[PDB]
Amino acid sequence: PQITLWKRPLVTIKIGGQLKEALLDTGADDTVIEEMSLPGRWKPKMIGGIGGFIKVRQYDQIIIEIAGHKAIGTVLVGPTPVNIIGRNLLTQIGATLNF
Amino acid sequence: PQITLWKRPLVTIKIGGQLKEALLDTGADDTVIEEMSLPGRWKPKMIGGIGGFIKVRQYDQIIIEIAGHKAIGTVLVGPTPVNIIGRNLLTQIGATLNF
Ligand SMILES: CC(C)CN(C[C@@H](O)[C@H](Cc1ccccc1)NC(=O)O[C@H]1CO[C@H]2OCC[C@H]21)S(=O)(=O)c1ccc2c(c1)OCO2
Ligand SMILES: [Cl-]
Ligand SMILES: [Cl-]
Ligand code: NA
């Protein structure tokens, strides 16, 4: 699709069999999701946003559907205010910015 | 242009007679620029992101040139770690997300 930006570019994602809402976010290097259970081991990561840095749990090679497109990649889990799909998965679904 | 998302979608902007680098950010409702002077009236605002909130100055009806495209809108000025072009101005240059 071609998504305009008059409203938040919210899509449905599927992770762990559950549907969630998430923001397509070209200003996010990484994908960050609210607290949830994911399988496997995790590694520590600190990410820096507008208000400062937070600690998150990094899960690699997680299967996630984004707006009907399949991706498998790194998902960070932590106290983000909204679920954000960052460039690491936007590139896997073939997203570009166009003007 | 068509901008891929392998790297940060940074562009050059002109604001307040100054050239700056800024992030084209579909996850940002608002445009947020590092501390600078702008003419006219402003009012305080709090905006929140990962890490929490920062206090900003809200300037309305500011003209910005974004990758050579002129837009006018509200610009928030404050201690953002990155200059961000948010949806309020991305719409005006006709930016879309495509996949
Ligand atoms: C988190 C989302 C919902 C909002 N943010 C825009 C993001 O694109 C933000 C923009 C951002 C970019 C860099 C530094 C700080 C903020 N990115 C971000 O936090 O990404 C984090 C996850 O991946 C990492 O790579 C980027 C930082 C990490 S934001 O910067 O907090 C923001 C911008 C304008 C706003 C606003 C919040 O509220 C109202 O207007
Ligand atoms: Cl830790
Ligand atoms: Cl505006
Ligand atoms: Na003004």
Tally of CB atoms within 10 A around A78? 17
Among A3, A47, A94, whose Cβ lies nearest the Cβ of B50? A47
- By three-state DSSP, how is residue A41 classified? coil
Measured distance CA(A54)–CA(A12) in Å, rounded:
25
Q: In terms of DSSP bridges, do strands B69-77 and B32-33 run parallel, antiparallel, or are they unpaired?
A: parallel
Ligand 1 centroid distance, CA of B27 (Å):
7
Measured distance CA(B49)–CA(A80) in Å, rounded:
8
Long-range contacts (CB closer than 8 Å, 24 or more residues apart) made by A37-46: A38/A62, A38/A75, A38/A77, A42/A77, A45/A76
Domain range summary for chain B, segments of one domain joined by +? 1-99
Amino acid symbol at B38: L
Burial B9-47 (b: 16+ CB within 10 A, else e): bebebebbeeeeebbbbbbbebbbbeeeebeeebeebeb
Tally of CB atoms within 10 A around A79? 13
A1-99 is classed CATH 2.40.170.20: no
Measured distance CA(A89)–CA(A99) in Å, rounded:
21
Cβ of residue B48 closer than 8 Å to a chain A Cβ: yes
Q: Which residues pair with B10 in a beta bridge?
A: B23
Could you identify the residue written with the tokens 């445009």? Answer: B31
Measured distance CA(A88)–CA(A28) in Å, rounded:
9
Taking the CA of residue A40 and the nearest CA in chain B, the distance in Å comes to: 25
Backbone angles phi, psi at A94, to 5 degrees: 85, 25
Nearest in space to A57 (alpha carbons), one of A43, A37, A39, A71? A43
A35's tokens: 């607290």
Could you identify the residue written with the tokens 């809402």? Answer: A21
Resolution (A): 1.6
Transcribe B35-93 into DSSP letters: S---SS-EEEEEEEETTEEEEEEEEEEEEEEETTEEEEEEEEES--SS-EE-HHHHTTT
Amino acid symbol at A56: V
A26 with B97: Cβ contact below 8 A:
yes
